[PDB]
Design an enzyme around this catalytic site. Structure first.
Site: not given
Length: 124
Positions: A10, A12, A41-45, A66, A85, A119-121
């Protein structure tokens, strides 16, 4: 309820398009994937590849996370991704995002049995 693997899909995965479909893509997808319900959410890919190609990344180059630990893996090939972003004038509940298309290696953390992305790192 969502398992960690289902939440990764959901948050990514969007194989329904080959790249961000226009400059309005993150503004619509951040809301429709429910990432702006309680805060912006400030950033998501997002990843525009088959899930089978993304799950295979779990057996590729092992790297430190990271953030996590060292159960992150970086893809050998580059992948079609979109970076979302938050923009300067965004403010909850009117979260607004800049959409950027990119073609980069992805790094995901994997866990479980079967061993899949949870997780997307990062992207590099």
């Amino acid at each position: 309820k969502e398992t960690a693997a289902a939440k990764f899909e959901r948050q990514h995965m969007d194989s329904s398009t080959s790249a961000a479909s226009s400059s309005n893509y993150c503004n619509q997808m951040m809301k429709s994937r429910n990432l702006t319900k309680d805060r912006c959410k400030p950033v998501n890919t997002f990843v525009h590849e088959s899930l089978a190609d993304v799950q295979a990344v779990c057996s590729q180059k092992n790297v430190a996370c990271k953030x996590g630990q060292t159960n992150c893996y970086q893809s050998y090939s580059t992948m079609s991704i979109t970076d979302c972003r938050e923009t300067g004038s965004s403010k909850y509940p009117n979260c607004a995002y800049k959409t950027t298309q990119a073609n980069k290696h992805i790094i995901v953390a994997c866990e479980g049995n079967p061993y899949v992305p949870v997780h997307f790192d990062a992207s590099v």
